[PDB]
Amino acid sequence: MAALSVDEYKLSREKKLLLQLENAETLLAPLHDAKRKIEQEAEAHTDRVAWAGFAASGVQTGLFARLTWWEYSWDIVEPVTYFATYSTVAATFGYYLYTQQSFEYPSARERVYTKQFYRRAQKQNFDIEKYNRLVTEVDELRNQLKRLRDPLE
Amino acid sequence: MAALSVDEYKLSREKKLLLQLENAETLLAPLHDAKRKIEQEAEAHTDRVAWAGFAASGVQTGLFARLTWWEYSWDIVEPVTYFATYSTVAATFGYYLYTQQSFEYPSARERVYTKQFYRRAQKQNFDIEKYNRLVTEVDELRNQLKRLRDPLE
Amino acid sequence: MAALSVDEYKLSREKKLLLQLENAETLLAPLHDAKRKIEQEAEAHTDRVAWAGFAASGVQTGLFARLTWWEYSWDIVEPVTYFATYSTVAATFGYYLYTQQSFEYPSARERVYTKQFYRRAQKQNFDIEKYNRLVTEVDELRNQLKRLRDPLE
Amino acid sequence: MAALSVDEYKLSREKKLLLQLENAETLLAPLHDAKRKIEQEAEAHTDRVAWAGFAASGVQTGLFARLTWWEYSWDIVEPVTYFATYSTVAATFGYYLYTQQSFEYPSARERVYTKQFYRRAQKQNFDIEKYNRLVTEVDELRNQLKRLRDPLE
Amino acid sequence: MAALSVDEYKLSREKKLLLQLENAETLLAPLHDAKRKIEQEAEAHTDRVAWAGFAASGVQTGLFARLTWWEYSWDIVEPVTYFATYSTVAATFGYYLYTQQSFEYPSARERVYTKQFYRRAQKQNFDIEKYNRLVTEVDELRNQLKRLRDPLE
Numbered sequence: 001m002a003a004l005s006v007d008e009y010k011l012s013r014e015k016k017l018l019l020q021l022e023n024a025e026t027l028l029a030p031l032h033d034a035k036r037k038i039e040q041e042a043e044a045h046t047d048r049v050a051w052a053g054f055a056a057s058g059v060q061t062g063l064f065a066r067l068t069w070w071e072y073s074w075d076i077v078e079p080v081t082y083f084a085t086y087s088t089v090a091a092t093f094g095y096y097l098y099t100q101q102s103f104e105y106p107s108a109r110e111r112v113y114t115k116q117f118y119r120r121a122q123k124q125n126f127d128i129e130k131y132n133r134l135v136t137e138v139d140e141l142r143n144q145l146k147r148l149r150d151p152l153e
Numbered sequence: 154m155a156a157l158s159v160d161e162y163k164l165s166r167e168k169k170l171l172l173q174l175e176n177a178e179t180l181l182a183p184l185h186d187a188k189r190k191i192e193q194e195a196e197a198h199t200d201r202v203a204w205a206g207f208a209a210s211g212v213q214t215g216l217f218a219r220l221t222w223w224e225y226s227w228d229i230v231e232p233v234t235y236f237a238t239y240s241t242v243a244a245t246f247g248y249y250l251y252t253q254q255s256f257e258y259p260s261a262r263e264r265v266y267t268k269q270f271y272r273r274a275q276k277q278n279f280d281i282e283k284y285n286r287l288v289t290e291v292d293e294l295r296n297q298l299k300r301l302r303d304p305l306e
Numbered sequence: 307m308a309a310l311s312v313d314e315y316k317l318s319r320e321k322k323l324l325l326q327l328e329n330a331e332t333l334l335a336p337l338h339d340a341k342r343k344i345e346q347e348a349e350a351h352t353d354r355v356a357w358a359g360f361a362a363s364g365v366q367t368g369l370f371a372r373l374t375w376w377e378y379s380w381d382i383v384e385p386v387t388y389f390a391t392y393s394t395v396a397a398t399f400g401y402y403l404y405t406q407q408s409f410e411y412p413s414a415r416e417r418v419y420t421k422q423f424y425r426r427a428q429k430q431n432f433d434i435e436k437y438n439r440l441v442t443e444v445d446e447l448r449n450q451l452k453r454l455r456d457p458l459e
Numbered sequence: 460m461a462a463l464s465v466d467e468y469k470l471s472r473e474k475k476l477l478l479q480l481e482n483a484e485t486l487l488a489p490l491h492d493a494k495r496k497i498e499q500e501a502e503a504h505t506d507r508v509a510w511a512g513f514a515a516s517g518v519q520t521g522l523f524a525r526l527t528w529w530e531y532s533w534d535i536v537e538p539v540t541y542f543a544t545y546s547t548v549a550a551t552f553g554y555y556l557y558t559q560q561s562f563e564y565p566s567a568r569e570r571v572y573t574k575q576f577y578r579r580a581q582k583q584n585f586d587i588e589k590y591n592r593l594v595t596e597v598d599e600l601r602n603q604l605k606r607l608r609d610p611l612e
Numbered sequence: 613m614a615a616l617s618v619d620e621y622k623l624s625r626e627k628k629l630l631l632q633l634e635n636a637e638t639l640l641a642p643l644h645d646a647k648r649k650i651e652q653e654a655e656a657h658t659d660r661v662a663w664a665g666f667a668a669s670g671v672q673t674g675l676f677a678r679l680t681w682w683e684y685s686w687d688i689v690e691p692v693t694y695f696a697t698y699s700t701v702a703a704t705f706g707y708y709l710y711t712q713q714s715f716e717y718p719s720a721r722e723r724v725y726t727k728q729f730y731r732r733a734q735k736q737n738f739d740i741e742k743y744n745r746l747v748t749e750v751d752e753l754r755n756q757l758k759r760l761r762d763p764l765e
Contacts, residue, residue, distance in 0.1 A: 322605055325608075329601050329602075333598070379532070381532055381535060383535050383538070384537070387538075387541055387542070390545065391545065397549070398548060401554070401555055404555070437590070437591060437594075440591065440595055443597075444594075447604060450601070450604045451608075454607055454608040454612065457610075457611035459611045459612065
């Protein structure tokens with residue numbers, strides 16, 4: 001009585017409460033809030049949108065070339081700007097990557113020793129996780145109807 | 154004389170109506186009605202697409218430069234509109250921001266102490282809120298069949 | 307001299323029919339054909355898609371200036387097409403407003419009492435309408451289940 | 460004992476089978492096979508992407524024009540490729556009409572308004588048909604509870 | 613125990629496990645679990661957006677042509693970036709076939725018996741498949757109700 005818990009040693013100690021508890025674990029909004037806090041080292045998304053950063057950096061050498069072209073023709077304007085438009089379509093790929101960005105972020109090393117683990121960082125949630133995971137709560141009502149079918153009369 | 158409700162009342166002690174009331178809260182009509190009351194904030198969104206307004210403002214004075222060195226070649230026209238095209242792709246980013254724009258301000262003043270009654274800026278959605286929350290009505294389904302599974306033997 | 311409905315055809319076997327009818331009302335196919343007609347009368351918001359026409363039409367007169375100063379250089383082509391690329395995104399904004407454009411009419415003119423309120427019968431239809439309304443047919447499953455829960459044999 | 464199962468009460472005949480048969484029709488797998496049969500005539504969609512086919516056809520004759528007036532100055536390159544990008548945005552619209560195309564697909568075969576009428580027939584499916592139609596199989600569970608709710612359970 | 617299942621239970625033998633087994637086939641996380649583990653080999657799509665790879669290869673050599681006719685004018689630069697941009701809109705189509713590729717790959721080289729598979733391909737499934745397939749688990753829920761419904765009434 002001094003110890004007290006919910007797991008181990010049972011005798012129909014309110015079965016209805018345990019099924020209600022299983023539903024709360026499936027929603028796991030608490031853990032989703034912990035991913036939002038990570039705002040500091042969160043640049044793990046920016047580095048994938050930075051793929052476009054190397055494309056525009058190449059022209060920096062090209063600006064010296066307009067100064068040289070004073071014998072070719074000179075008329076060659078717009079090079080820094082056409083490369084900049086190519087970067088904006090790169091912004092468009094990002095519509096898909098939104099939730100998934102958490103999957104590539106951890107190293108999943110574990111080989112050379114270990115440390116923390118109570119953080120995971122492989123969910124984020126705002127839509128993909130919310131729809132698949134909560135309809136899966138349906139899978140729990142499929143277990144309860146299963147036993148109703150064996151007795152009747 | 155009615156039809157949407159047979160007789161006065163009988164097979165309804167108090168409990169069935171309360172559960173029906175939980176479904177009305179899940180749909181979220183009140184909070185959706187609140188979006189109609191402040192509707193004028195639709196300009197709060199046009200202030201985020203204005204990020205693009207500073208990009209075109211840089212060259213606008215640049216027209217004066219063509220007048221200044223008219224002898225180099227002149228064939229250097231086209232600069233003000235091509236920066237305007239960079240703004241046109243910015244209109245495309247907007248597919249993300251409609252339902253999400255309400256999340257932008259809390260992520261600078263989220264708090265937890267007292268707060269505005271019990272709300273959480275859960276406005277602006279017209280689709281993400283409607284589908285996810287309604288399947289949660291199936292969560293309530295799981296509470297009623299669990300009691301039936303215990304008797305019948 | 308009746309026989310279609312007066313006696314026997316509704317002795318005490320109408321409650322089962324009432325649940326079958328409630329699911330049928332949510333499905334609504336007769337009324338859905340009336341919603342489809344709005345796509346013709348949708349000419350209201352097409353004035354906001356026509357924004358694309360005035361942009362490209364205004365500049366055609368600018369090209370005439372190339373004919374007046376034909377000696378400056380001439381190499382200045384392409385201006386009518388860059389405004390046209392801006393028109394190409396206008397097709398891109400379209401998929402979003404497509405079902406939703408109906409949202410403007412329910413607002414009703416300044417005259418309360420009777421205006422197809424709650425039932426709407428004038429809102430959107432092509433894909434947001436079927437998904438929301440039929441999963442609600444499942445919410446009726448939650449109502450029959452509760453009266454089913456009171457029993458115990 | 461020598462039979463179909465151990466017992467399961469011999470009183471099925473066809474009714475248990477008939478509800479199971481309704482679920483198989485609902486998934487949509489043979490009607491989907493019908494989409495495979497017309498795969499050679501599925502080029503019917505190109506007629507709607509051809510709305511843009513007129514945009515690229517304008518300048519196509521223009522290539523002959525740079526060669527004829529080569530004396531003015533020259534330096535007018537790049538016209539054909541930017542018009543080609545305008546055709547690619549038309550490819551982006553293609554996600555709206557893709558599953559729906561079954562409505563426009565008949566053509567050059569209509570007079571008495573009606574056509575086909577071989578049990579509606581959508582003769583197309585890859586995502587919109589599959590999602591809506593199967594949550595409707597859940598509507599059929601709404602019928603099974605209605606009979607259980609009339610006795611005890 | 614070195615025999616029988618993991619752990620037994622009262623009023624069970626194999627029938628309770630068999631209904632759970634139908635649910636396990638619908639879930640079949642295995643192949644979906646394999647997609648996160650092999651993420652590096654996910655280049656199975658990078659060969660589909662390559663359809664456009666032949667478009668940019670044409671002008672790449674074209675730079676040499678500016679050197680051959682160096683007296684025409686020279687102001688003919690800029691061809692390579694707009695053709696490269698034509699490939700990025702090809703990335704935009706990429707959102708349609710992206711998970712679906714799983715259906716096409718089997719219909720090309722089979723003869724399975726190994727384990728490592730030198731073919732280097734497998735079923736993706738984690739968004740179009742996960743949402744529809746899982747609610748189908750609710751279809752088995754419709755089967756339980758049929759059998760408790762027939763004995764009483």
